[PDB]
Amino acid sequence: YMRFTENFERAKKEALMSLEIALRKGEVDEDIIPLLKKINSIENYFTTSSCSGRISVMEMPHFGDKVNAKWLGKWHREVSLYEVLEAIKKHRSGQLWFLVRSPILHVGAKTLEDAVKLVNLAVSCGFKYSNIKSISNKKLIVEIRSTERMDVLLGENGEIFVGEEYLNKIVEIANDQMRRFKEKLKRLESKINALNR
Amino acid sequence: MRFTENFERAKKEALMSLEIALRKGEVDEDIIPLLKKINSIENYFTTSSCSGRISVMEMPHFGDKVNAKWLGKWHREVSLYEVLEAIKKHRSGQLWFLVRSPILHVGAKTLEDAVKLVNLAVSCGFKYSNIKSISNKKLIVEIRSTERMDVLLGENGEIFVGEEYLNKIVEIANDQMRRFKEKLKRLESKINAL
């Protein structure tokens, strides 16, 4: 027996209300709202801030409003070439990166047993980077994440090293990854029901 | 419990493998002292690990590990010369320049030891550290950093990147590799008994 188990009841209550506020404010990635509700509908789990896949364009270390990272564009869906080019034109200082980030789910678990089952289920659904992120006397957080990450260096200090055709290939590749996130995210949602009891 | 009761023997099996791997020169001599240091702590033991790597490889498609092939692979800062030489071997498929962070796998006696190592690794700069798995035989902690890079260099024999661009890619890649070696040393020095 352990403290996070003792505190699970209180933790889920807090986490749920926190989620209701987020839903009421339309600040929860739409693609995962059902999935999140299904997970919370299971007795031994609850969700904390999560998010769906996303493509982005950002410069770092930015040189402006005293902020290390500045995002020139953010998309939670497949992107079109000209949208990305428009973001890129805004580049001024630091290194310019085109990123692809996998969807990420944080799930509180009632016991170690619950945590391990969620992890194996997540892995078998294609999310190979799922694991147990942290254990305190308050909660046990499980992290569900996939592997199709991308970190493309496209320029530095205002100078764009690539042209339109090259960037075109990159975009295609990023979309291929996004579509894969969605499918792995569909498999996970269909198998999540069995996890109940 | 299960892994706790089995810890004593699981460490022995691990030390044997580590021992073999060392005489066969399979472990990155980069992190050998760090591995020995971790194993010197009673409640921990190491399993397959790497000190981070820079790679020039070709694959049919991005993320295709089953068919990816190395033209150049290094676990230390590289020179533009080396990278160019690996590039010149490109024939087919897509050519990718990659940077991946170190990955350490460490077994732990109790859940409590795992959390301490996870928290220690995180303060040392390994943000993606976590408990990879808990089973009957062992509890594995994964220490890893967030930094990486993926750059398409060319395809089917045609090279896309110019010299200025390659110049930067290498410079940036070396900055990340330097950070990996620094974080690993930081972690190594933080490994105190209690």
Tab-separated table of C-alpha atoms in Angstrom:
chain	number	residue	atom	x	y	z
A	1	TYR	CA	0.000	0.000	0.000
A	2	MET	CA	1.168	3.551	-0.716
A	3	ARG	CA	0.334	7.209	-0.121
A	4	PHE	CA	-0.703	7.977	-3.695
A	5	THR	CA	-3.286	5.199	-3.367
A	6	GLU	CA	-4.515	6.692	-0.086
A	7	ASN	CA	-4.769	10.062	-1.845
A	8	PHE	CA	-6.225	8.823	-5.138
A	9	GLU	CA	-9.818	9.630	-4.196
A	10	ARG	CA	-8.963	13.246	-3.404
A	11	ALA	CA	-6.685	13.502	-6.441
A	12	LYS	CA	-9.270	12.279	-8.945
A	13	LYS	CA	-11.849	14.691	-7.546
A	14	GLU	CA	-9.492	17.640	-7.990
A	15	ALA	CA	-8.340	16.455	-11.427
A	16	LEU	CA	-11.912	16.022	-12.704
A	17	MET	CA	-13.105	19.456	-11.611
A	18	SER	CA	-9.947	20.877	-13.119
A	19	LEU	CA	-10.894	19.130	-16.371
A	20	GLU	CA	-14.439	20.490	-16.300
A	21	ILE	CA	-13.125	24.034	-16.066
A	22	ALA	CA	-10.820	23.342	-19.031
A	23	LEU	CA	-13.677	21.882	-21.110
A	24	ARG	CA	-15.972	24.777	-20.222
A	25	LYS	CA	-13.304	27.128	-21.576
A	26	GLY	CA	-12.692	25.193	-24.783
A	27	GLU	CA	-9.057	24.749	-23.782
A	28	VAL	CA	-8.772	20.987	-24.351
A	29	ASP	CA	-7.609	19.601	-27.703
A	30	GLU	CA	-10.819	18.428	-29.426
A	31	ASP	CA	-9.328	15.255	-30.950
A	32	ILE	CA	-8.866	13.750	-27.492
A	33	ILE	CA	-11.948	14.863	-25.542
A	34	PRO	CA	-13.791	11.554	-25.890
A	35	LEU	CA	-10.649	9.564	-25.075
A	36	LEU	CA	-10.040	11.623	-21.949
A	37	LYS	CA	-13.647	11.215	-20.743
A	38	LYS	CA	-13.526	7.453	-21.286
A	39	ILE	CA	-10.314	7.188	-19.242
A	40	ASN	CA	-11.829	9.176	-16.371
A	41	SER	CA	-14.933	7.018	-16.602
A	42	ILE	CA	-12.744	4.188	-15.296
A	43	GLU	CA	-12.514	3.881	-11.503
A	44	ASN	CA	-8.741	3.472	-11.198
A	45	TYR	CA	-7.658	6.338	-13.477
A	46	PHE	CA	-7.926	10.078	-14.056
A	47	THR	CA	-6.330	12.507	-16.481
A	48	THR	CA	-4.208	15.600	-16.046
A	49	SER	CA	-3.254	18.167	-18.707
A	50	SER	CA	-2.868	16.372	-21.981
A	51	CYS	CA	-2.672	17.253	-25.687
A	52	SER	CA	-2.930	15.904	-29.217
A	53	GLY	CA	-0.202	15.799	-31.847
A	54	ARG	CA	1.052	19.083	-33.230
A	55	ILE	CA	3.287	20.587	-35.869
A	56	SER	CA	5.084	23.857	-35.161
A	57	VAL	CA	7.652	26.371	-36.338
A	58	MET	CA	9.677	28.162	-33.649
A	59	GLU	CA	12.924	30.101	-33.184
A	60	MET	CA	15.365	29.674	-30.300
A	61	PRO	CA	17.101	31.297	-28.585
A	62	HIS	CA	14.766	34.128	-29.585
A	63	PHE	CA	16.050	37.701	-29.178
A	64	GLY	CA	13.074	39.906	-28.310
A	65	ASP	CA	10.574	39.959	-25.448
A	66	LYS	CA	13.159	38.239	-23.259
A	67	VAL	CA	11.808	34.799	-24.131
A	68	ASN	CA	13.911	31.736	-24.916
A	69	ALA	CA	11.331	30.185	-27.335
A	70	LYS	CA	9.004	31.970	-29.712
A	71	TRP	CA	6.507	30.005	-31.806
A	72	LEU	CA	5.975	31.327	-35.336
A	73	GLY	CA	3.200	28.841	-36.013
A	74	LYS	CA	1.291	26.000	-34.334
A	75	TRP	CA	-0.989	23.428	-35.924
A	76	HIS	CA	-2.851	20.509	-34.346
A	77	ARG	CA	-3.624	18.951	-37.747
A	78	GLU	CA	-1.920	18.119	-41.047
A	79	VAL	CA	-0.498	21.331	-42.486
A	80	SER	CA	-0.308	22.941	-45.908
A	81	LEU	CA	2.981	24.077	-47.401
A	82	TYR	CA	2.121	27.781	-47.683
A	83	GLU	CA	1.021	28.042	-44.041
A	84	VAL	CA	4.431	26.796	-42.941
A	85	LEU	CA	6.246	29.135	-45.336
A	86	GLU	CA	4.327	32.061	-43.906
A	87	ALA	CA	5.383	31.121	-40.387
A	88	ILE	CA	8.993	30.761	-41.485
A	89	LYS	CA	9.119	34.224	-43.082
A	90	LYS	CA	8.596	35.606	-39.597
A	91	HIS	CA	11.947	34.188	-38.477
A	92	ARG	CA	14.405	36.781	-37.147
A	93	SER	CA	16.871	35.485	-34.545
A	94	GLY	CA	18.208	32.304	-33.037
A	95	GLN	CA	17.814	28.872	-34.552
A	96	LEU	CA	14.754	28.105	-36.639
A	97	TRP	CA	13.100	24.739	-36.049
A	98	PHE	CA	10.215	22.852	-37.601
A	99	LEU	CA	8.818	20.459	-34.967
A	100	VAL	CA	6.461	17.489	-34.939
A	101	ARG	CA	5.325	16.449	-31.473
A	102	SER	CA	3.423	13.281	-30.642
A	103	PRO	CA	0.155	13.432	-28.725
A	104	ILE	CA	0.795	13.211	-24.978
A	105	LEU	CA	-1.494	11.867	-22.273
A	106	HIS	CA	-0.921	12.124	-18.547
A	107	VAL	CA	-2.973	9.732	-16.492
A	108	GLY	CA	-3.141	9.351	-12.754
A	109	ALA	CA	-3.392	5.765	-11.525
A	110	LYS	CA	-4.797	4.385	-8.271
A	111	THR	CA	-2.203	1.623	-7.829
A	112	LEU	CA	1.055	0.353	-9.294
A	113	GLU	CA	-0.911	-2.507	-10.844
A	114	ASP	CA	-3.236	-0.084	-12.633
A	115	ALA	CA	-0.285	1.951	-13.850
A	116	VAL	CA	1.570	-1.008	-15.341
A	117	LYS	CA	-1.512	-2.266	-17.189
A	118	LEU	CA	-2.139	1.160	-18.693
A	119	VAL	CA	1.496	1.316	-19.857
A	120	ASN	CA	1.485	-2.120	-21.532
A	121	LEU	CA	-1.845	-1.356	-23.195
A	122	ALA	CA	-0.498	1.981	-24.416
A	123	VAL	CA	2.700	0.417	-25.756
A	124	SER	CA	0.802	-2.298	-27.609
A	125	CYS	CA	-1.238	0.455	-29.277
A	126	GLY	CA	1.941	1.875	-30.816
A	127	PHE	CA	2.830	4.348	-28.039
A	128	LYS	CA	6.281	2.953	-27.287
A	129	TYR	CA	7.380	5.907	-25.152
A	130	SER	CA	4.681	5.357	-22.554
A	131	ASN	CA	5.918	4.943	-19.000
A	132	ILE	CA	5.540	5.959	-15.363
A	133	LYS	CA	6.633	9.615	-15.217
A	134	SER	CA	6.490	10.292	-11.503
A	135	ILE	CA	5.523	8.969	-8.073
A	136	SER	CA	4.791	11.202	-5.114
A	137	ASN	CA	2.880	10.823	-1.886
A	138	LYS	CA	0.018	12.458	-3.799
A	139	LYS	CA	-0.217	10.777	-7.207
A	140	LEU	CA	1.256	8.408	-9.764
A	141	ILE	CA	1.382	9.847	-13.263
A	142	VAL	CA	1.547	7.599	-16.320
A	143	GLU	CA	2.750	9.171	-19.558
A	144	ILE	CA	1.481	7.946	-22.903
A	145	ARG	CA	3.519	9.110	-25.898
A	146	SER	CA	4.411	7.815	-29.356
A	147	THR	CA	7.699	7.905	-31.292
A	148	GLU	CA	7.164	9.870	-34.533
A	149	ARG	CA	8.891	13.005	-33.275
A	150	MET	CA	10.656	15.477	-35.588
A	151	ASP	CA	13.143	18.273	-34.895
A	152	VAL	CA	14.194	19.905	-38.184
A	153	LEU	CA	16.760	22.729	-38.211
A	154	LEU	CA	15.783	25.062	-41.073
A	155	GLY	CA	17.798	28.189	-40.446
A	156	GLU	CA	19.599	30.503	-38.076
A	157	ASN	CA	19.734	34.205	-37.285
A	158	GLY	CA	17.175	35.106	-39.926
A	159	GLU	CA	18.819	33.092	-42.688
A	160	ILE	CA	16.605	30.340	-44.103
A	161	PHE	CA	18.809	27.476	-45.275
A	162	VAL	CA	16.104	25.715	-47.269
A	163	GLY	CA	13.920	26.461	-50.253
A	164	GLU	CA	10.291	25.769	-51.091
A	165	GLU	CA	10.750	22.356	-52.703
A	166	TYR	CA	12.804	21.015	-49.797
A	167	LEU	CA	10.347	22.354	-47.262
A	168	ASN	CA	7.656	20.658	-49.304
A	169	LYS	CA	9.209	17.232	-48.701
A	170	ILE	CA	9.484	17.988	-45.004
A	171	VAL	CA	5.831	18.986	-44.724
A	172	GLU	CA	4.750	15.742	-46.419
A	173	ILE	CA	6.834	13.780	-43.915
A	174	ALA	CA	5.395	15.647	-40.932
A	175	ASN	CA	1.843	14.985	-42.167
A	176	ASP	CA	2.666	11.312	-42.588
A	177	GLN	CA	3.636	11.312	-38.912
A	178	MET	CA	0.511	13.191	-37.834
A	179	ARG	CA	-1.774	10.757	-39.654
A	180	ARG	CA	0.027	7.971	-37.808
A	181	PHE	CA	-0.591	9.660	-34.438
A	182	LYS	CA	-4.292	9.747	-35.206
A	183	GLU	CA	-4.479	6.075	-36.120
A	184	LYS	CA	-2.502	4.963	-33.055
A	185	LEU	CA	-4.790	7.234	-31.043
A	186	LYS	CA	-7.828	5.487	-32.526
A	187	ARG	CA	-6.534	2.024	-31.654
A	188	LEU	CA	-5.892	3.135	-28.061
A	189	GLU	CA	-9.397	4.517	-27.659
A	190	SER	CA	-11.019	1.312	-28.905
A	191	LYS	CA	-9.004	-0.868	-26.527
A	192	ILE	CA	-9.396	1.419	-23.515
A	193	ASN	CA	-12.822	-0.032	-22.600
A	194	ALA	CA	-11.379	-3.436	-21.689
A	195	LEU	CA	-9.088	-1.725	-19.187
A	196	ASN	CA	-12.159	-1.166	-17.011
A	197	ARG	CA	-11.995	-3.739	-14.209
B	1	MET	CA	8.577	-7.166	-3.810
B	2	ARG	CA	8.803	-9.472	-6.824
B	3	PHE	CA	11.578	-7.404	-8.371
B	4	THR	CA	12.815	-6.573	-4.875
B	5	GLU	CA	13.104	-10.260	-3.965
B	6	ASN	CA	14.764	-10.854	-7.325
B	7	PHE	CA	17.013	-7.771	-7.238
B	8	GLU	CA	20.024	-9.538	-5.749
B	9	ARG	CA	20.204	-12.047	-8.611
B	10	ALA	CA	19.131	-9.639	-11.348
B	11	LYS	CA	22.114	-7.435	-10.473
B	12	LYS	CA	24.431	-10.425	-10.724
B	13	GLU	CA	23.149	-11.318	-14.186
B	14	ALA	CA	23.514	-7.675	-15.243
B	15	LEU	CA	27.066	-7.392	-13.929
B	16	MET	CA	27.985	-10.524	-15.871
B	17	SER	CA	26.592	-9.098	-19.088
B	18	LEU	CA	28.283	-5.786	-18.408
B	19	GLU	CA	31.498	-7.714	-17.777
B	20	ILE	CA	31.256	-9.548	-21.092
B	21	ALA	CA	30.289	-6.383	-22.991
B	22	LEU	CA	33.394	-4.677	-21.598
B	23	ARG	CA	35.887	-7.336	-22.661
B	24	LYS	CA	34.254	-7.367	-26.089
B	25	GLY	CA	34.491	-3.574	-26.259
B	26	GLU	CA	30.753	-3.105	-26.871
B	27	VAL	CA	30.126	-0.316	-24.363
B	28	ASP	CA	30.812	3.307	-25.214
B	29	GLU	CA	34.027	3.950	-23.310
B	30	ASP	CA	32.442	7.413	-23.008
B	31	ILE	CA	30.180	6.416	-20.103
B	32	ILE	CA	32.135	3.494	-18.678
B	33	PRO	CA	33.034	5.242	-15.419
B	34	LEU	CA	29.420	6.363	-14.988
B	35	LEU	CA	28.229	2.796	-15.447
B	36	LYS	CA	30.757	1.472	-12.984
B	37	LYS	CA	29.776	4.201	-10.517
B	38	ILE	CA	26.054	3.374	-10.680
B	39	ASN	CA	26.766	-0.316	-10.172
B	40	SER	CA	28.867	0.556	-7.122
B	41	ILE	CA	25.652	1.735	-5.440
B	42	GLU	CA	23.985	-1.177	-3.637
B	43	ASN	CA	20.412	-0.637	-4.842
B	44	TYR	CA	21.122	-0.008	-8.517
B	45	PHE	CA	22.530	-1.907	-11.495
B	46	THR	CA	22.889	-1.113	-15.207
B	47	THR	CA	21.644	-2.772	-18.393
B	48	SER	CA	22.234	-1.824	-22.062
B	49	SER	CA	22.928	1.846	-22.427
B	50	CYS	CA	24.537	4.484	-24.804
B	51	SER	CA	26.191	7.907	-24.438
B	52	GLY	CA	24.256	9.646	-27.209
B	53	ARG	CA	24.969	9.598	-30.909
B	54	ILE	CA	25.265	11.567	-34.127
B	55	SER	CA	24.378	9.612	-37.284
B	56	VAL	CA	24.284	9.943	-41.057
B	57	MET	CA	22.100	7.138	-42.316
B	58	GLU	CA	19.877	6.179	-45.187
B	59	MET	CA	16.413	4.697	-45.027
B	60	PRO	CA	13.433	4.201	-47.323
B	61	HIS	CA	11.420	6.612	-45.185
B	62	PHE	CA	11.842	8.672	-42.018
B	63	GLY	CA	11.427	6.570	-38.883
B	64	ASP	CA	12.025	3.319	-40.772
B	65	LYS	CA	14.385	1.565	-38.358
B	66	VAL	CA	13.915	-1.912	-39.846
B	67	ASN	CA	15.572	-0.760	-43.076
B	68	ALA	CA	17.777	2.143	-41.918
B	69	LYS	CA	21.499	1.772	-42.642
B	70	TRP	CA	24.446	3.629	-41.074
B	71	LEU	CA	26.949	5.391	-43.306
B	72	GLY	CA	28.472	7.230	-40.340
B	73	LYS	CA	27.835	6.839	-36.603
B	74	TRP	CA	29.629	8.626	-33.732
B	75	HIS	CA	29.184	9.002	-29.971
B	76	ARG	CA	31.368	12.110	-29.656
B	77	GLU	CA	31.541	15.509	-31.345
B	78	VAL	CA	32.248	15.164	-35.044
B	79	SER	CA	34.160	17.086	-37.666
B	80	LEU	CA	32.666	18.397	-40.917
B	81	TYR	CA	35.185	16.184	-42.713
B	82	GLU	CA	33.883	12.943	-41.155
B	83	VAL	CA	30.277	13.843	-41.861
B	84	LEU	CA	31.058	14.737	-45.478
B	85	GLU	CA	32.845	11.389	-45.924
B	86	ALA	CA	29.815	9.469	-44.635
B	87	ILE	CA	27.557	11.522	-46.908
B	88	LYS	CA	29.612	10.657	-50.016
B	89	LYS	CA	28.637	7.023	-49.488
B	90	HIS	CA	24.967	7.805	-50.170
B	91	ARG	CA	23.442	5.687	-52.963
B	92	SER	CA	19.733	5.078	-52.436
B	93	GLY	CA	16.758	5.924	-50.261
B	94	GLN	CA	16.579	9.029	-48.097
B	95	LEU	CA	19.717	10.415	-46.449
B	96	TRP	CA	19.212	11.632	-42.880
B	97	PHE	CA	21.468	13.374	-40.388
B	98	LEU	CA	20.404	12.423	-36.874
B	99	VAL	CA	21.224	13.349	-33.309
B	100	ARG	CA	19.868	11.216	-30.472
B	101	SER	CA	20.357	11.607	-26.746
B	102	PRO	CA	22.036	9.140	-24.361
B	103	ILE	CA	19.858	6.380	-22.998
B	104	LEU	CA	20.686	4.692	-19.706
B	105	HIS	CA	18.726	1.747	-18.366
B	106	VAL	CA	19.124	1.168	-14.663
B	107	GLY	CA	17.542	-1.484	-12.489
B	108	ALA	CA	16.478	-0.473	-8.976
B	109	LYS	CA	15.984	-2.435	-5.748
B	110	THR	CA	12.871	-0.677	-4.491
B	111	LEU	CA	10.325	1.695	-5.980
B	112	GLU	CA	11.784	4.346	-3.660
B	113	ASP	CA	15.296	3.998	-5.127
B	114	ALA	CA	13.828	4.431	-8.613
B	115	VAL	CA	12.127	7.724	-7.739
B	116	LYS	CA	15.315	9.072	-6.191
B	117	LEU	CA	17.302	8.259	-9.335
B	118	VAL	CA	14.537	9.657	-11.572
B	119	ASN	CA	14.465	12.914	-9.612
B	120	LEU	CA	18.265	13.039	-9.547
B	121	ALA	CA	18.489	12.495	-13.309
B	122	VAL	CA	15.886	15.169	-13.983
B	123	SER	CA	17.749	17.804	-11.960
B	124	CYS	CA	20.864	16.788	-13.881
B	125	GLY	CA	19.211	17.717	-17.174
B	126	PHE	CA	17.629	14.411	-18.222
B	127	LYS	CA	14.052	15.652	-18.519
B	128	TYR	CA	12.730	12.460	-20.082
B	129	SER	CA	13.833	10.236	-17.192
B	130	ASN	CA	11.235	7.795	-15.908
B	131	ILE	CA	10.334	4.275	-14.822
B	132	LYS	CA	10.315	2.309	-18.064
B	133	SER	CA	8.934	-0.892	-16.632
B	134	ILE	CA	7.956	-2.771	-13.523
B	135	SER	CA	7.702	-6.544	-13.689
B	136	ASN	CA	8.298	-9.653	-11.611
B	137	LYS	CA	12.007	-9.808	-12.433
B	138	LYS	CA	12.979	-6.111	-12.293
B	139	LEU	CA	12.137	-2.404	-12.117
B	140	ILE	CA	13.843	-0.401	-14.874
B	141	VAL	CA	14.533	3.347	-14.820
B	142	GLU	CA	15.197	5.117	-18.132
B	143	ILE	CA	17.350	8.220	-18.109
B	144	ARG	CA	17.176	10.222	-21.319
B	145	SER	CA	17.401	13.785	-22.512
B	146	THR	CA	15.020	15.725	-24.755
B	147	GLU	CA	17.461	17.143	-27.319
B	148	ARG	CA	17.545	15.683	-30.819
B	149	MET	CA	17.779	16.610	-34.482
B	150	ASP	CA	16.438	15.235	-37.751
B	151	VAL	CA	17.533	16.759	-41.055
B	152	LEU	CA	16.864	15.418	-44.562
B	153	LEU	CA	20.172	15.667	-46.461
B	154	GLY	CA	19.155	14.188	-49.793
B	155	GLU	CA	17.473	11.285	-51.586
B	156	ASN	CA	18.323	8.564	-54.107
B	157	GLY	CA	21.799	9.980	-54.664
B	158	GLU	CA	20.882	13.660	-54.856
B	159	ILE	CA	22.130	15.864	-52.013
B	160	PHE	CA	19.901	18.800	-51.008
B	161	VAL	CA	21.800	20.693	-48.304
B	162	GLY	CA	24.329	23.356	-49.169
B	163	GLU	CA	27.628	23.983	-47.409
B	164	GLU	CA	26.447	26.823	-45.196
B	165	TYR	CA	23.543	24.665	-44.002
B	166	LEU	CA	25.669	21.556	-43.416
B	167	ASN	CA	28.143	23.808	-41.607
B	168	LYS	CA	25.434	24.841	-39.121
B	169	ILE	CA	23.892	21.389	-38.786
B	170	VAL	CA	27.257	20.064	-37.608
B	171	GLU	CA	27.896	23.040	-35.339
B	172	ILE	CA	24.470	22.668	-33.708
B	173	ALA	CA	24.784	18.886	-33.499
B	174	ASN	CA	28.087	19.254	-31.696
B	175	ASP	CA	26.555	21.723	-29.224
B	176	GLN	CA	23.874	19.138	-28.362
B	177	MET	CA	26.460	16.353	-28.062
B	178	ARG	CA	28.519	18.537	-25.756
B	179	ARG	CA	25.448	19.040	-23.589
B	180	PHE	CA	24.923	15.258	-23.484
B	181	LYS	CA	28.485	14.665	-22.257
B	182	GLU	CA	28.090	17.485	-19.697
B	183	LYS	CA	24.819	16.164	-18.316
B	184	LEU	CA	26.277	12.650	-18.084
B	185	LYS	CA	29.244	13.977	-16.091
B	186	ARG	CA	26.957	16.038	-13.886
B	187	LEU	CA	24.967	12.886	-13.133
B	188	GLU	CA	28.140	10.913	-12.498
B	189	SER	CA	29.420	13.372	-9.909
B	190	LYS	CA	26.025	13.443	-8.190
B	191	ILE	CA	26.148	9.721	-7.522
B	192	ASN	CA	26.922	9.927	-3.811
B	193	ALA	CA	26.335	7.078	-1.367
B	194	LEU	CA	23.548	8.623	0.697
